[PDB]
């Protein structure tokens, strides 16, 4: 728990931590899937300039 | 007459053959671009060179 009780909190201040550990795992999975198709799109953009 | 029949046709035959060589060169250069970019491997780039030769 990351706040002092009875205090004034601002909008967007982090209040707790809910042990990610699984959302971290599927974030790593989605990032790994992104990192190959991003390179494929970047390569096909260079190739489509003269219709390879 | 056989020599003149050869002279009248070998112009079009050589024009077609060197246009075929030019098209194979352009195909090989596009395959070399796909190899330099990263999409194709060396086995396909080498396969285009044999058709060029």
From TrEMBL, chain A:
Domain of life, source organism: Bacteria
Cell compartments where the protein resides: Cell inner membrane
Similarity comment text for this entry: Belongs to the membrane fusion protein (MFP) (TC 8.A.1) family.
Entry protein name: MexA family multidrug efflux RND transporter periplasmic adaptor subunit
Lineage of producing organism: Bacteria, Pseudomonadati, Pseudomonadota, Gammaproteobacteria, Pseudomonadales
Residues represented out of the complete protein: 136 to 187 of 442
């Amino acid at each position: 728990r990351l706040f002092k009780e009875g205090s004034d909190v601002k909008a967007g201040q982090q209040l707790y931590q809910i042990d990610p550990a699984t959302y971290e795992a599927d974030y790593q999975s989605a990032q790994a899937n992104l990192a190959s198709t991003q390179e494929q799109a970047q390569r096909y953009k260079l190739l489509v300039a003269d219709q390879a | 007459a056989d020599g003149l029949a050869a002279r009248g046709t070998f112009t079009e035959q050589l024009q077609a053959q060197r246009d075929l060589v030019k098209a194979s060169d352009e195909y090989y250069q596009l395959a070399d671009k796909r190899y330099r970019t990263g999409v194709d491997n060396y086995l396909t780039l080498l396969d285009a060179q044999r058709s060029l030769f």
